[PDB]
């Protein structure tokens, strides 16, 4: 015989902060030997990027 109007909340996530990691900086920076050792691994950095 009677009706009650009530409101409910519902929170859904949408998107997170976009991340871009610096690959050769994070592996080891400021070294020519690092470049010579990372360029012979094929593609383990471009795929991640």
């Amino acid at each position: 015989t009677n009706f009650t109007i009530s409101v409910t909340t519902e929170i859904l996530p949408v998107s997170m902060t976009k991340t871009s990691v610096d690959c050769t900086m994070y592996i080891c920076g400021d070294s020519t030997e690092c470049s010579n050792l990372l360029l012979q691994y094929g593609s383990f950095c471009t795929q991640l990027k």
Binding site: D22, T24, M25, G29, D30
Partner: protein, 50 residues
């Protein structure tokens, strides 16, 4: 396409003072020295060498 990394233009180094003044002039310049059979053993420690 790449990353922008500015490189340092030069490199500096810092270190503590050369303390305790390691005695090298008393051994290398002495008025009297010992004998070849009775040589005196001198040890320098607890000081950074120059």
């Amino acid at each position: 396409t790449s990353n922008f990394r500015v490189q340092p233009t030069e490199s500096i180094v810092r270190f503590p003072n050369i303390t305790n003044l390691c005695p090298f002039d008393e051994v290398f310049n002495a008025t009297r020295f010992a004998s070849v059979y009775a040589w005196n053993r001198k040890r320098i420690s607890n000081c950074v060498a120059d």
